[PDB]
Structure 1
Amino acid sequence: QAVTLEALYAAIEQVLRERLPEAQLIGFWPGVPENTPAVSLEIAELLPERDPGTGESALLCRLQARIMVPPGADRQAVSIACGIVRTLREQTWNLSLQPARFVRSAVDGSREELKSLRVWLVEWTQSLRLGDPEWAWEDQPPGSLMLGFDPQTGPGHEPDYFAPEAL
């Protein structure tokens, strides 16, 4: 029914392994740039949105992809980066979401270790309605309604009438 963040992490890993065979390893929280064409997904920031009228909390998450590559293969990482951007134009990751909004793609300087020097941040935002809807007003089912009249009114004699009856 409703979405979960673990349901979101599994489907973005799932589709990106199909479309990118040159990307050897697309993990959602890995480390250790063990080999050349690696892509490490992240989470940058999850922000509020226009709250819908139910119990779901609207959140747009700045999803983030980091394309790890040894230096000297910068062009080989833009071709990985162009593969991610062409995905994000219509992609809902098959999970009842809104299509993801692409934000930017550029080379950054990480706080982390730089043995694999060249990394390309590819970040995008997509809205989430996490959680269950919550009903608040009235919980009176169709099985409970009796409709009397003016003389058939009172705690002495009950209004002997159901709403599903004869024709």
Structure 2
Amino acid sequence: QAVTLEALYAAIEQVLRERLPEAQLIGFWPGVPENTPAVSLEIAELLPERDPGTGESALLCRLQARIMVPPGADRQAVSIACGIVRTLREQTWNLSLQPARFVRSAVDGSREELKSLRVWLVEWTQSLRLGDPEWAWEDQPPGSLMLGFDPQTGPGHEPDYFAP
């Protein structure tokens, strides 16, 4: 039903490894610039939005991508950046989300180490309903059923329940 950040972090890694085979290594919090065409996702800032009428928290996250590359492969790193921007026009990442809004792409100066001198910030925002809904007050478990009563249940009561 509703989304989670851990389900969101895996699916952005999932699609970008499928659509981009030239990207050798996709991860949501990597390090260690071991080779040339590396892509390091990040998180910049998560901002509020118009709160819907249930217990959902509306959040737009600046999903930040940093394309680290050693100098001399400047043209080869914009072609990595052009693959991400052409994805983000309609992409909902197969997660019942809104399509992501592309924001910018430019050369920046990182605070981090500059062995890979040229870095390209790619940030985009998409809305999230992370708060648990109040439309339904229960869950849907499959299996066999056990029925108990008021002053006889809890975790310390195994033989109270019945299953005819």
- Verify same fold: TM over 0.5: yes
- Asked if the contact 2:13–2:26 (Cα under 8 Å) also holds between the matched residues in 1, the reply is yes
Residue 122 of structure 2 corresponds to 122
Residue 137 (str. 1) matches residue 146 (str. 2): no
Q: Which runs of 5+ in 2 are unaligned?
A: none
Q: Distance in 2 between matches of 1:154 and 1:112?
A: 52
- Asked if the contact 1:36–1:69 (Cα under 8 Å) also holds between the matched residues in 2, the reply is yes
Q: Distance in 1 between matches of 2:37 and 2:127?
A: 29
Say if 1:135 and 1:17 are closer, same or farther in 2 by CA, change over 3 A. closer
- State the SS of the aligned residue for 1:162: coil
- Asked if the contact 1:106–1:121 (Cα under 8 Å) also holds between the matched residues in 2, the reply is yes
TM-score (norm 2): 0.81
Say if 1:118 and 1:2 are closer, same or farther in 2 by CA, change over 3 A. same
Percent pairwise identity? 100
- Shift of residue 72, structure 1, vs aligned partner: 1.1
- Shift of residue 138, structure 1, vs aligned partner: 15
- Asked if the contact 1:147–1:159 (Cα under 8 Å) also holds between the matched residues in 2, the reply is no
- Asked if the contact 2:17–2:26 (Cα under 8 Å) also holds between the matched residues in 1, the reply is yes
Q: Distance in 1 between matches of 2:108 and 2:154?
A: 78
- Asked if the contact 2:29–2:42 (Cα under 8 Å) also holds between the matched residues in 1, the reply is yes
- Asked if the contact 1:38–1:67 (Cα under 8 Å) also holds between the matched residues in 2, the reply is yes
Q: Deviations over 1:48-104 (max 9, x none)?
A: 000001100000000000011111111111100000000000000000100000000
Q: Which runs of 5+ in 1 are unaligned?
A: none
- Shift of residue 134, structure 1, vs aligned partner: 2.4
Pick which of 154-163 and 13-22 moved more: 154-163
- Asked if the contact 2:153–2:160 (Cα under 8 Å) also holds between the matched residues in 1, the reply is no
TM-score (norm 1): 0.80
When the two chains are superposed, the root-mean-square deviation of aligned CA atoms in Å is 8.4
Say if 1:85 and 1:142 are closer, same or farther in 2 by CA, change over 3 A. closer
Say if 1:145 and 1:19 are closer, same or farther in 2 by CA, change over 3 A. closer
Q: Distance in 2 between matches of 1:4 and 1:94?
A: 13
- Asked if the contact 1:91–1:99 (Cα under 8 Å) also holds between the matched residues in 2, the reply is yes
Count of aligned residue pairs for this structure pair: 164
Which consecutive segments of 4 or more residues in structure 1 shift more than 3 A?
135-164
Say if 1:41 and 1:157 are closer, same or farther in 2 by CA, change over 3 A. closer
The correspondence of residues 1-167 of structure 1 with structure 2, limited to 5 A, is 1-134=1-134
- Shift of residue 34, structure 1, vs aligned partner: 0.3
Q: Distance in 2 between matches of 1:112 and 1:154?
A: 52
